[PDB]
Amino acid sequence: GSSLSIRTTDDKSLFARTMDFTMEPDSKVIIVPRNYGIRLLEKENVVINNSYAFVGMGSTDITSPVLYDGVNEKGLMGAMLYYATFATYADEPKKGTRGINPVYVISQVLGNCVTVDDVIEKLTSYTLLNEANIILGFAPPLHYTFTDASGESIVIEPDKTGITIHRKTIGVMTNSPGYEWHQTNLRAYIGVTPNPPQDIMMGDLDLTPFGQGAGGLGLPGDFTPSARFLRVAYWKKYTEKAKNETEGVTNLFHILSSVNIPKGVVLTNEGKTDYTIYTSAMCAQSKNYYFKLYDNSRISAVSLMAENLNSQDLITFEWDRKQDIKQLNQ
Amino acid sequence: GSSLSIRTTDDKSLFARTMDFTMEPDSKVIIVPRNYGIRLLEKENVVINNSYAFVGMGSTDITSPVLYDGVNEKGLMGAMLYYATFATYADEPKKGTRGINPVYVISQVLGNCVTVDDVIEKLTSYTLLNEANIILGFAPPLHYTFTDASGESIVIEPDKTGITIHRKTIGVMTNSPGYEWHQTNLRAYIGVTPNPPQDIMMGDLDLTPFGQGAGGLGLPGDFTPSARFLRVAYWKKYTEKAKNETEGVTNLFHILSSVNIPKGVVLTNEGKTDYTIYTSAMCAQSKNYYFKLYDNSRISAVSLMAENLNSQDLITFEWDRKQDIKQLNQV
Amino acid sequence: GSSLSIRTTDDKSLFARTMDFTMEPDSKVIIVPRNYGIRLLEKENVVINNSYAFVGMGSTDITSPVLYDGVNEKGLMGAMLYYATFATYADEPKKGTRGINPVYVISQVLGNCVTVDDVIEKLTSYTLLNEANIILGFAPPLHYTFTDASGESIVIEPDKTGITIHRKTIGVMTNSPGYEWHQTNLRAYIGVTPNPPQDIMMGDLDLTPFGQGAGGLGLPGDFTPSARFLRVAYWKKYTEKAKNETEGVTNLFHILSSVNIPKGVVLTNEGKTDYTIYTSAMCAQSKNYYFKLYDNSRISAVSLMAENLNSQDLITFEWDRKQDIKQLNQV
Amino acid sequence: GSSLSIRTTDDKSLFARTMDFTMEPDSKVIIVPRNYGIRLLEKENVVINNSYAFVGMGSTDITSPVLYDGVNEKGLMGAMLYYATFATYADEPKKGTRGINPVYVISQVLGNCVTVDDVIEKLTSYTLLNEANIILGFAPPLHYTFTDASGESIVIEPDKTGITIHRKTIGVMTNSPGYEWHQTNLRAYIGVTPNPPQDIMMGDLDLTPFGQGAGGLGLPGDFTPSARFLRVAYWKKYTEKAKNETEGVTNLFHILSSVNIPKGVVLTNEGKTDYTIYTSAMCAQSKNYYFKLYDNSRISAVSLMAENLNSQDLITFEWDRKQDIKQLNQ
Ligand SMILES: CC1(C)S[C@@H]2[C@H](NC(=O)COc3ccccc3)C(=O)N2[C@H]1C(=O)O
Ligand SMILES: CC1(C)S[C@@H]2[C@H](NC(=O)COc3ccccc3)C(=O)N2[C@H]1C(=O)O
Ligand SMILES: CC1(C)S[C@@H]2[C@H](NC(=O)COc3ccccc3)C(=O)N2[C@H]1C(=O)O
Ligand SMILES: CC1(C)S[C@@H]2[C@H](NC(=O)COc3ccccc3)C(=O)N2[C@H]1C(=O)O
């Protein structure tokens, strides 16, 4: 998948993520309220009490709410994205550390944390562990991005050297490899702009472009994580600033679109389709969650703030996998 | 912009296109009814009479309705797209031809034609002229694609040598250069697949890809016309066979999304921002014309087989330039 | 392979080409003298008589000398290169044409022609036939480039529609597809420059390139014909104006080096290894033909304006397939 | 520049390097014999006594022989290549370390070291220093590759974290960025082979390639260090094994050629040409040095073994910047 944060021009931070998977059963939008318990591991019993309510896209098939992204009531936003062959986990916690499940990292940070630093500290009392949840069958190689209300982003990744933190990132993350590497890849591609190369001659012949779009030459178009990072970064940089929160979601979906993967164009070596099952955006300041799906391109939205925050069970919706065409006449 | 037709499994032809421009003049959905009247030229009063009623996206700022694409009541779909530096027009009609404004051809084909050969034969009595319009300020360099209910597809292209007809096209079209050139560019990319590269060794070091989608390696990703064509064909090829009309409209919007241009990422020589104004799709069997827009990713649909098809007046629907977000709880 | 002509500042035209093949049959430098005799066809005994003597690389395994490229005593340079899937030949000559073996045209142009229009006009009396030879086993799909002492350049291309002449070419040619197609592909790469991209900021992070040569971003690097053409033209464009013949021969070999294929990096459908057998350059004003080879990066030169130009017999020079390393001290 | 080692099939290791610069005055091939002194710094006086004789391309304008590449008599081969914006140097040595000049690293390792491990050890009694030699005007951002007779390669690079060593590399190095990054870039490009993609159809149309060469699609062609690494790596991998030492030099020059830079096609922001001024190859087993230049494509060779190794002054040659065309007739 691919993610990014942007900064509205009326002091408002937004974060969006594409989920790319090989077939998505289930997954609703869950507001999880205060004082629900979120477990830490699955085969053992500790379950931290969340100070904060948050909301996002997740599962509900194991025993604590699993969230892939979300905003909590204090303006911190987050995602776990795949991260194949670079994710490393422990068997048992370290010294003065106790253990956590990759799939649980988000719920737990979003229920407890507010600043982006709060997340770096929280995550040195954690060692990630090699536990296979039943909804997949194994521990998804993951890495996490996060973004507080101020718009400062961070990437946390579980390498084999140990947990790697990157402060003050450019607010973009996709998938493997490490964020360090994508950030230096960016340089190879600085020539990719919105501006036309200027006309040339080859002897007597005059050479001018086929039409508009040529400043972009070099930018790869495949759906490889390295390219996906490249396009999301590069169209974040040049895309026009969003003046308001609605415009933010719109941009965020226009940029993600360049990396949105149709059914069938990417196969695995087993032979299943890898496609964009949904794509969402969240706002720090209003604590809104907006989302879109493969089978429907109408953004649905929940407001976390206008709900019973305090509050016996989780609140649920519930995917409309059907194209919501407005008929202007019958 | 960029286009293509696909065919579903319930025997249904569908054609979609994005429109890329530096600013929107007022456009709308326009239903043109039988016997309305469409000029050939802006400076002349000859007004040929449309046999058929149709529906598409168009302008209304000039004497007759101008359609960028759409579908008449006999299930013929088409569009005009930009075709810069290649498009050539006349000063006067060749002997035994009526002259025509290039912005008027879709209207005129869509009001009087049913099959693809109908359009081929129709443009023998025609000569594209160098006529301006008050909408843009000049005769825009265009070429045309068309797609009848059977699924066949063509490209009419006004070149320096004359009007060039390409028959049994793959049903994808972009902008310049000419259809044969793009059709031969496809060759240089046949190793763009949905499949993964095999693993290799470089000495004792093992190499396997970053995650996925490496079979696509070499597909360009910019928004030049020539890149768009590639994306649009290769992703047309591999995307899943659509099964119904609606899931057909989705596939089209997904395939087109790969070539949807956000504001600011493409600038002009005068630094105008070139972006996808709207995307539309239409169907031959239902005669339904769908569309989203830059600020509204919600699809609106218009049925044409439900209207006063012999109406005296145009039937039009204004743009909803407002992002139409559903509230799942009170927001 | 890949070719091009350049012009120096002491008013000298030079043409170089690489030859890419899956194995070398015996080839050599061949000086063909005036009045030698060159067949049109292998199965026929008509033997037209060469006005001019020339020199180039060729075979000797068939009844007449076969030249892949070279330069006659009137300073006309040329080559035949592969032209797969596009090249079309006859079964019989069109009315009022003598038939010819495609492998024989360079010989026949080089023995009887002086300027580029001479060659254009000459191939109106000609029809490429489908005639095999015992060297390769079949009529190879080819096209031809030519370059006279004035610097002008042309591409003769045997298409399905017929023989296609492109005049005032940029003087670069590769393999397929057709010259117009490559000439229009150049457009999609005009932002391949020797200049650095400007520095940018992405938020607060500063970006500047890895070292150098980033203006080249987007130039493909594979050994498809279409890539080679690009490399060869853009590096023809920017490389430094050569000042003399010899430094002219170097530039050519440098520009060609970018498209020189090492053994094993390109395989065939039957898995034959396709590699650059040799590179040659020749000059119009000196009538000197230069060449290195895969195993000998040392250039050997043959002067033609020093021989028995009316000799009864061929004059030939065997390949030195031995890397010719200088010993600066006793090695 | 760009470099690589290959392994002959008769138990013989060879290493070649392209030198890319913005104008090359001077530079001969220098055999430096045993018991010559090689300084360590330029403004201060320590000068280590070399156990071994070696030979390569270098300068002779400062006060100790500067070598860019070479082989010593014990079969170790080496190069310094540029390394812009990633090279970091100290002002003063560390603890138990004393100081060295980037330009001197090669002479000194090649005069003293035999195994590739010998080089890792030697280089933890060294801290590189910020001293501006007169032939350039400043300390060239450098990084070093090395290769012993056994064919095991290593890359040493001076990062800002400190000196970075990579063991058992793939035997390829160009320029920035770090070797770690190029090695993981390699994966993005595994699809680049010698084999044709197989034919496809688009509806009724048949699609087959323009001709031979299409397995290579994706490989970039620019002269950027990242691409240059990519081509040198990828054509090293697929190029046919060299059966003997002569064939080794030939391959090594056929592979380097793909990354050999013509005059004029690369400019700097000041506006000077950046071109390949020479390109050389060396053998572990025979201790031969072979070289080629921009203006001449005939390989000249020195044999280190057939010289006075022991031995008052340096031995010199001396560039023939003139195309050595054999005339087969006058
Ligand atoms: C005056 C313009 C800014 S608008 C007109 C025209 N159209 C567009 O920009 C619309 O999109 C394109 C789509 C494909 C190729 C070229 C352009 C074009 O080019 N134009 C510009 C130009 O020529 O500078
Ligand atoms: C089990 C799987 C079907 S899913 C897992 C992995 N990931 C995905 O499909 C998710 O999508 C990604 C897309 C790009 C980069 C990383 C991940 C992959 O490859 N996998 C497959 C595999 O080959 O085992
Ligand atoms: C001083 C210089 C002319 S040389 C220095 C640097 N390097 C080179 O020209 C050498 O060539 C390289 C080529 C590729 C990567 C790294 C180096 C560069 O850029 N430079 C120039 C600069 O811009 O200051
Ligand atoms: C029989 C062959 C291996 S040799 C013949 C022919 N030529 C080459 O491989 C020479 O190089 C080329 C140069 C440009 C385009 C195509 C080929 C070709 O293709 N051939 C091969 C084929 O068609 O498989």
**3-state SS, residue A1:** coil
Contacts of D205 in chain B (CB under 8 A): 170, 183, 186
Q: Closest-CA residue in chain D for C231? A: D221
Q: Count CA atoms within 13 Å of residue A171 on its CB side.
A: 24
Q: Can you tell me the distance from the alpha carbon of A288 to that of A71, in angstroms, rounded to the nearest whole number?
A: 8
Q: Which of C240, C271, C235 is nearest to C2 (CA)?
A: C235
Q: Can you tell me the distance from the alpha carbon of A237 to that of C203, in angstroms, rounded to the nearest whole number?
A: 8
C: neighbours with 3+ CB pairs under 8 Å?
Answer: A, B, D
Ligand 1 surroundings by CB, under 6 angstroms: A 211-212; B 20-22, 82, 84, 175, 225, 268-270, 272, 274
Subunit contact A194:B266, Cβ cutoff 8 A: yes
Q: How far is the CA of D12 from the centre of ligand 3 (A)?
A: 34
Please check whether residue B18 is in contact with residue B275, taking contact to mean a CB–CB distance below 8 angstroms. Answer: no
Smallest CA–CA distance, residue A172 to chain D, in Å, is 19
Subunit contact A221:B224, Cβ cutoff 8 A: no
* Resolution of this deposited model, Å: 2.6
Q: Indicate which atom in ligand 2 lies nearest the CA of residue A21.
A: 10
Of D264, D323, D327, the CB nearest to C250: D323
Contacts of B185 in chain C (CB under 8 A): 185
Please check whether residue A283 is in contact with residue A12, taking contact to mean a CB–CB distance below 8 angstroms. Answer: yes
With residue C234 as reference, give the H or E element that holds it. helix C225-238
CATH number (3.60.60.10, 3.40.50.300, 3.10.310.30, 3.30.70.1280) of A1-330 reads 3.60.60.10
Tell how strand C296-303 and strand D326-329 pair up: parallel
Q: How far is the CA of B215 from the centre of ligand 1 (A)?
A: 33
Q: Indicate which atom in ligand 1 lies nearest the CA of residue B176.
A: 15
Q: Which of B22, B17, B112 is nearest to B70 (CA)?
A: B17
The answer for residues whose C-beta is within 8 angstroms of residue D324's C-beta and 6 or more apart is: C298, C299, C326, D296, D298
Q: Indicate which atom in ligand 2 lies nearest the CA of residue A224.
A: 14
Q: Closest-CA residue in chain B for C183? A: B181
Please check whether residue C90 is in contact with residue C128, taking contact to mean a CB–CB distance below 8 angstroms. Answer: yes
The answer for residues whose C-beta is within 8 angstroms of residue C135's C-beta and 6 or more apart is: C25, C59, C61, C62, C66, C103
Contacts of D233 in chain B (CB under 8 A): 202
Other CB atoms within a 10 A radius of the CB of residue C95 amount to 6
The answer for residues whose C-beta is within 8 angstroms of residue D206's C-beta and 6 or more apart is: D199
| A112, A172, A185 from A252: Cα distances, Å | 26, 12, 22
Ligand 4 surroundings by CB, under 6 angstroms: C 20-22, 82, 84, 175, 225, 268-270, 272, 274; D 211-212
CATH number (3.60.60.10, 3.50.50.60, 3.40.50.2300, 3.40.50.720) of B1-331 reads 3.60.60.10
Q: Indicate which atom in ligand 3 lies nearest the CA of residue D269.
A: 23
Q: Can you tell me the distance from the alpha carbon of C313 to that of C302, in angstroms, rounded to the nearest whole number?
A: 17
Q: How buried is residue C136: exposed, middle or buried, by Cβ count under 10 Å (0-12/13-18/19+)?
A: middle
Q: What is the dihedral of CA A94, A95, A99, A102, to 10 degrees?
A: -40
Q: Can you tell me the distance from the alpha carbon of D185 to that of C50, in angstroms, rounded to the nearest whole number?
A: 57
**3-state SS, residue D259:** coil
Please check whether residue C262 is in contact with residue C26, taking contact to mean a CB–CB distance below 8 angstroms. Answer: no
Subunit contact A208:C197, Cβ cutoff 8 A: no
**Rounded to the nearest 5°, which phi and psi values hold at C172?**
-135, 145
Please check whether residue C147 is in contact with residue C171, taking contact to mean a CB–CB distance below 8 angstroms. Answer: yes
Q: Can you tell me the distance from the alpha carbon of A117 to that of D16, in angstroms, rounded to the nearest whole number?
A: 49
Only one residue has tokens 């420059």, namely C193
Q: Which two tokens stand for residue D245?
A: 């030492």
**Rounded to the nearest 5°, which phi and psi values hold at B263?**
-65, 125
Contacts of B224 in chain C (CB under 8 A): 188
Task: Name which of C266, C309, C314 to mutate to probe chain D: the one with the most chain D Cβ atoms within 10 A of its Cβ.
Answer: C266
Task: Read off the amino acid at residue D310.
Answer: N
Q: Which two tokens stand for residue D128?
A: 């590189």
**Rounded to the nearest 5°, which phi and psi values hold at A257?**
-60, -45
Q: Closest-CA residue in chain C for B176? A: C184
Q: How far is the CA of A10 from the centre of ligand 3 (A)?
A: 43
Please check whether residue C30 is in contact with residue C65, taking contact to mean a CB–CB distance below 8 angstroms. Answer: yes
According to DSSP, the residues that pair with A71 across neighbouring strands are A55, A77
Please check whether residue D222 is in contact with residue C193, taking contact to mean a CB–CB distance below 8 angstroms. Answer: no
Other CB atoms within a 10 A radius of the CB of residue D206 amount to 9
Please check whether residue B205 is in contact with residue B190, taking contact to mean a CB–CB distance below 8 angstroms. Answer: no
B: neighbours with 3+ CB pairs under 8 Å?
Answer: A, C, D
Helical H segments across A186-294, by residue range: 225-238, 245-257
Q: Can you tell me the distance from the alpha carbon of A297 to that of A290, in angstroms, rounded to the nearest whole number?
A: 12
According to DSSP, the residues that pair with A145 across neighbouring strands are A79, A155
Q: How far is the CA of B160 from the centre of ligand 1 (A)?
A: 20
Contacts of D177 in chain A (CB under 8 A): 184
Only one residue has tokens 């050969």, namely B117
**3-state SS, residue D235:** helix
Experimental technique used to determine this entry? X-ray
Of C170, C183, C214, the CB nearest to A191: C214
Q: Which two tokens stand for residue A24?
A: 């998505």
Q: Which of B299, B287, B302, B289 is nearest to B257 (CA)?
A: B299
The answer for residues whose C-beta is within 8 angstroms of residue A136's C-beta and 6 or more apart is: none
**3-state SS, residue A249:** helix
For ligand 1, pick from A195, A199, A212 the residue to mutate: most ligand atoms within 8 Å of CB: A212
Write the DSSP symbol of residue C103: G
Helical H segments across chain A, by residue range: 105-112, 117-122, 179-185, 225-238, 245-257
Of D187, D214, D237, the CB nearest to B191: D214
D126: left (phi over 0), alpha (psi -120 to 50) or beta: beta
Q: Can you tell me the distance from the alpha carbon of A268 to that of B59, in angstroms, rounded to the nearest whole number?
A: 46
**Rounded to the nearest 5°, which phi and psi values hold at D42?**
-105, -35
Task: Name which of D174, D179, D187 to mutate to probe chain A: the one with the most chain A Cβ atoms within 10 A of its Cβ.
Answer: D187
Write the DSSP symbol of residue A118: H
**3-state SS, residue D324:** coil
DSSP readout, D98-142?
A: --B-GGGHHHHHHHH--SSHHHHHHTTS--BB----TTTSS---E
Contacts of A258 in chain B (CB under 8 A): 221, 257-258, 260, 262
Q: Can you tell me the distance from the alpha carbon of C292 to that of D97, in angstroms, rounded to the nearest whole number?
A: 51
Q: From the centroid of its chain, how far is CA A291?
A: 12
Question: Which stretches does DSSP call E strand in chain D?
Answer: 2-7, 13-21, 28-32, 37-39, 47-49, 54-59, 66-67, 69-72, 77-82, 142-147, 153-158, 163-166, 172-173, 200-202, 205-207, 275-283, 288-293, 296-303, 315-317, 326-329
Q: Can you tell me the distance from the alpha carbon of C233 to that of B74, in angstroms, rounded to the nearest whole number?
A: 50
The answer for residues whose C-beta is within 8 angstroms of residue A95's C-beta and 6 or more apart is: none
Subunit contact C202:A170, Cβ cutoff 8 A: yes
Q: Can you tell me the distance from the alpha carbon of A328 to that of A308, in angstroms, rounded to the nearest whole number?
A: 36
Of B191, B208, B209, the CB nearest to D217: B191
Other CB atoms within a 10 A radius of the CB of residue D115 amount to 16
Smallest CA–CA distance, residue B109 to chain A, in Å, is 25
Interior angle at CA A234, CA A231 and CA A237, nearest 5? 145
Smallest CA–CA distance, residue D49 to chain C, in Å, is 26
Tell how strand C200-202 and strand C205-207 pair up: antiparallel
Only one residue has tokens 């300073």, namely C75
Domain ranges of chain B: 1-331
**3-state SS, residue A147:** strand
Tell how strand A275-283 and strand A288-293 pair up: antiparallel
Q: Can you tell me the distance from the alpha carbon of C99 to that of C96, in angstroms, rounded to the nearest whole number?
A: 10
Q: Closest-CA residue in chain C for D216? A: C222
Other CB atoms within a 10 A radius of the CB of residue A157 amount to 24
Interior angle at CA C131, CA C128 and CA C133, nearest 5? 125
The answer for residues whose C-beta is within 8 angstroms of residue A121's C-beta and 6 or more apart is: none
Q: Can you tell me the distance from the alpha carbon of C230 to that of C218, in angstroms, rounded to the nearest whole number?
A: 11
Please check whether residue C173 is in contact with residue C155, taking contact to mean a CB–CB distance below 8 angstroms. Answer: yes
Q: What is the dihedral of CA A241, A244, A250, A255, to 10 degrees?
A: 30
Q: How far is the CA of C21 from the centre of ligand 4 (A)?
A: 7
The answer for residues whose C-beta is within 8 angstroms of residue D162's C-beta and 6 or more apart is: none
Q: Can you tell me the distance from the alpha carbon of B234 to that of B227, in angstroms, rounded to the nearest whole number?
A: 11
Helix axes of A245-257 and A225-238: crossing angle, nearest 10 degrees? 140
Q: Is the CB of A272 under 6 A from ligand 2?
A: yes
Smallest CA–CA distance, residue D61 to chain C, in Å, is 22
Q: Can you tell me the distance from the alpha carbon of C79 to that of C4, in angstroms, rounded to the nearest whole number?
A: 10
Task: Read off the amino acid at residue B33.
Answer: P
DSSP readout, B229-283?
A: HHHHHHHHHHS----SHHHHHHHHHHHHHTTPPPTTSSB-TT--B-EEEEEEEEE
Subunit contact A191:C183, Cβ cutoff 8 A: no
Q: How far is the CA of A269 from the centre of ligand 2 (A)?
A: 9
Q: Is the CB of A177 under 6 A from ligand 2?
A: no
Helix axes of B245-257 and B225-238: crossing angle, nearest 10 degrees? 140
Subunit contact B266:A221, Cβ cutoff 8 A: no
The answer for residues whose C-beta is within 8 angstroms of residue D185's C-beta and 6 or more apart is: A185, D226, D229, D230
- The sign of the CA dihedral A88, A91, A92, A95 is negative
Q: Which two tokens stand for residue D249?
A: 């030099």
Interior angle at CA D208, CA D204 and CA D212, nearest 5? 180
Contacts of C209 in chain D (CB under 8 A): 224
Q: Which two tokens stand for residue D100?
A: 């060295």
Write the DSSP symbol of residue C185: H
Q: Is the CB of D267 under 6 A from ligand 3?
A: no
Subunit contact A191:C233, Cβ cutoff 8 A: no
Interior angle at CA C330, CA C326 and CA D3, nearest 5? 55
Q: Can you tell me the distance from the alpha carbon of A118 to that of B231, in angstroms, rounded to the nearest whole number?
A: 43
Q: Tell the residue nearest (CA) to atom 21 of ligand 2.
A: A268
Q: Can you tell me the distance from the alpha carbon of D248 to that of D7, in angstroms, rounded to the nearest whole number?
A: 8
Task: Name which of D173, D207, D237 to mutate to probe chain B: the one with the most chain B Cβ atoms within 10 A of its Cβ.
Answer: D207
Q: How far is the CA of B269 from the centre of ligand 1 (A)?
A: 9
Q: Which two tokens stand for residue B10?
A: 């319930």
According to DSSP, the residues that pair with B206 across neighbouring strands are B201
Q: How far is the CA of D21 from the centre of ligand 3 (A)?
A: 7
